Amino acid sequence: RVKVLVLGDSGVGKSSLVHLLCHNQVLGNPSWTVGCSVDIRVHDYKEGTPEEKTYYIELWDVGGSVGSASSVKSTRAVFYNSVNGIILVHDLTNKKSSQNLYRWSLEVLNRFADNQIPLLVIGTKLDQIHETKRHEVLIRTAFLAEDFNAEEINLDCTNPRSSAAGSSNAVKLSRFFDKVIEKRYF
Amino acid sequence: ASLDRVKVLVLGDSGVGKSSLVHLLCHNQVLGNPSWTVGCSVDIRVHDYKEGTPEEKTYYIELWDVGGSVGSASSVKSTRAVFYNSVNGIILVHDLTNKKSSQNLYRWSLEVLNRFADNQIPLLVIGTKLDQIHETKRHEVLIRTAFLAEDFNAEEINLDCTNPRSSAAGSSNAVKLSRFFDKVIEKRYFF
Ligand SMILES: Nc1nc2c(ncn2[C@@H]2O[C@H](COP(=O)(O)OP(=O)(O)O)[C@@H](O)[C@H]2O)c(=O)[nH]1
Ligand SMILES: Nc1nc2c(ncn2[C@@H]2O[C@H](COP(=O)(O)OP(=O)(O)O)[C@@H](O)[C@H]2O)c(=O)[nH]1
Ligand SMILES: [Mg+2]
Numbered sequence A: 001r002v003k004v005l006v007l008g009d010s011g012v013g014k015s016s017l018v019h020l021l022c023h024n025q026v027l028g029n030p031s032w033t034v035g036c037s038v039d040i041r042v043h044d045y046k047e048g049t050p051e052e053k054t055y056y057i058e059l060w061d062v063g064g065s066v067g068s069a070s071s072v073k074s075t076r077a078v079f080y081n082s083v084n085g086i087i088l089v090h091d092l093t094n095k096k097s098s099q100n101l102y103r104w105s106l107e108v109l110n111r112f113a114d115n116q117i118p119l120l121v122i123g124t125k126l127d128q129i130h131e132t133k134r135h136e137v138l139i140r141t142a143f144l145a146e147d148f149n150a151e152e153i154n155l156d157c158t159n160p161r162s163s164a165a166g167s168s169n170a171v172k173l174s175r176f177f178d179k180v181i182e183k184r185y186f
Numbered sequence B: 001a002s003l004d005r006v007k008v009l010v011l012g013d014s015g016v017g018k019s020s021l022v023h024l025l026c027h028n029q030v031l032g033n034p035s036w037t038v039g040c041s042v043d044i045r046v047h048d049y050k051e052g053t054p055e056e057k058t059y060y061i062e063l064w065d066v067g068g069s070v071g072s073a074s075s076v077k078s079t080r081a082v083f084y085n086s087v088n089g090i091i092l093v094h095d096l097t098n099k100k101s102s103q104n105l106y107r108w109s110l111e112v113l114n115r116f117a118d119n120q121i122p123l124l125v126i127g128t129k130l131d132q133i134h135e136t137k138r139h140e141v142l143i144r145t146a147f148l149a150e151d152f153n154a155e156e157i158n159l160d161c162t163n164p165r166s167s168a169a170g171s172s173n174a175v176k177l178s179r180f181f182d183k184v185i186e187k188r189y190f191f
């Protein structure tokens, strides 16, 4: 059993990301996610090796807003227990959504050098960043990932090549999930 | 307060009242604007095991509303099946005005318990829309659901999910619900 929280502002592409991570295909008709949605990634630990083993990784998309009232956040807090990894999702076209990752992470880790829970920062809508602005956008997200002591992936969740097997993105994703499993069990 | 995870599946046909039931069980209020549930929805019931005794211990019980249809294609049920692992209890939900939804509970249970005397996972059968049953016919409906619940070796609760008093503390419903969750916890942790 493995529980990975998927955190981020509404509209950044969480449901699309989760769908790609669990089904290797693009989420075609994303609807507004009500409540906590859970999808399972059938994950090959140490993929491609003779010690390959299957784990069911639960991706918990709990939802909500960092601008919610205190009482709303307290009810959300019961979902943040027994967490084995966290994916922090931001929309690369919306600087507000990456800033809000600091609020999201504090909600969990207080209700970063000392944090032992593996973290992964994912920027979505990379396709929407003009080549003109890519250097500036990505320099900032590097600072973001370092603050969390986290690896970073930037991708287009609506392009199935984003996580194609053997791609650089797919390799980093497998490394993160293997680290989640290792810190939980080994 | 306990970091120990407890997983209870909530199974039943679309439209029987799963989301309304779960909302009442987790939020102590009626679900006012039920929408069509997409994919797997999870909510948490904070449960005091052996409440009121010196062994009282709080557990977070996850209610997993996985969804789908017993008529889905083989490939759909195969992907759904990965949601049925590490299960500590099952709530089987049927709509008391819809006899087909009760019959389909046999299919739902087979989907899980293949991926009833020998089953070790605690089961609870919950019939909804009791308010929609004519008072004349309530006795007849409840005789039938009693036999249904016996087939599953399960306790049964019948209620109106839109009446918040259905889960009133100390009521017959609340006692049976606590007994079920205590057995779920006991079979996982104190067995
Ligand atoms: N162009 C583009 N659109 C995206 C990307 N990721 C998500 N979307 C779109 O952004 C909208 C919000 O995505 P959704 O997954 O529902 O976001 P959520 O509210 O965080 O779960 C949807 O219309 C998606 O199709 C991406 O990488 N590129
Ligand atoms: N009168 C009555 N209506 C109910 C009851 N349970 C559910 N409903 C209604 O039945 C419809 C379907 O309920 P819902 O919770 O969405 O079912 P689901 O598809 O199983 O999640 C909704 O309009 C509910 O308001 C009940 O016990 N009594
Ligand atoms: Mg969503």
Ligand SMILES: [Mg+2]
Binding pocket: B018, B019, B020, B035, B036, B037
């Ligand atoms: Mg529903």
